[PDB]
Amino acid sequence: QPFQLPHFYLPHPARLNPHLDEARAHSTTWAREMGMLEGSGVWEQSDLEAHDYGLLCAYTHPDCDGPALSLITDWYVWVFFFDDHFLEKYKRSQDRLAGKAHLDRLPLFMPLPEPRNPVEAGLADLWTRTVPAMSADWRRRFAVATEHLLNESMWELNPVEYIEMRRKVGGAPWSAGLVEYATAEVPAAVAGTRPLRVLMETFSDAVHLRNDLFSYQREVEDEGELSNGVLVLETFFGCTTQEAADLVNDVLTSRLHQFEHTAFTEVPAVALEKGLTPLEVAAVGAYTKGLQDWQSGGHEWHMRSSRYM
């Protein structure tokens, strides 16, 4: 182990989704149907089964029913398979043009075309299944977030800078889109207000920092990935790895506190200040609870599963 895991701030206990096993079998079968499994040159069945993204989605989205959980699970399986496939067929072979054309072809499967690869097929099926359940606004926003996350893999060619950039280019807003699918979508009235932006900011920072704390083994040391919270703080402040871990954890705790504060106090305040109807207020609250649940279940999935892989 690179460092001893710091003391985590965990105000809300993680809850597990009762439909888990169903999501596991369905995600495996679906991943096979997309051609992401053996024969792809990227994943085998054992790899996907070892990753266990079904547990991640069941932990992060406890209140959604079985099929929705299955959909979210297929989304996560797809994006992780996207990362691996891009780091295999393109990044490894160092072909920029092919990957660029790929990243150009991907948004075409999310209209607001015939797949040449398992990624495009998966994205197509996922869009087909997901779209009827959400509005046009969510479609646009989630398409934008998705395209952001995908185009962030184009990189082949300072702590505050790192956190702020990862805030925009991370996978947290994407996951939050899937969250507002899991519970309720955020009304356009309070969508642009400061408390919601701070909500998204703190959430993103927290998730990303935690992920950095748990990925230091397989990314910094083993892979050689230069982007990590712990690594950045370590090189910047000249601190030892453990000290950097403790600092990142402290910042994480602070972001969680600001998260809770703005969520359970300021957000309903700006919800009432914008004259939002109670029906939409319930949606905002459900969204907040969805974020909290996602954080909790995420940490729990990291602790109980991923760190042993």
Task: Write up this protein.
The structure is a monomer. The chain is an all-alpha fold and 309 residues long. It has one domain: Farnesyl Diphosphate Synthase (Orthogonal Bundle), CATH 1.10.600. Helices cover 68% and strands 0% of the residues. Keywords: Lyase, Magnesium, Metal-binding, Repeat.
Sum up the structure in keywords.
14 helices, Farnesyl Diphosphate Synthase, 309 residues, terpene cyclase, lyase, 68% helix, 0% strand, mainly alpha
β-strand number:
0
First-last Cα distance: 12 Å
H and E order: HHHHHHHHHHHHHH
Q: Considering the protein shown, what is the CATH homologous superfamily? A: Farnesyl Diphosphate Synthase
* Helix-residue proportion: 55-70%
Shape: globular
**Helix count from the secondary structure assignment:** 14
Region (Germacradienol/germacrene D synthase): 1-309
Motif (DDXXD motif 1): 83-88
Protein name: Germacradienol/geosmin synthase
Family: Belongs to the terpene synthase family.
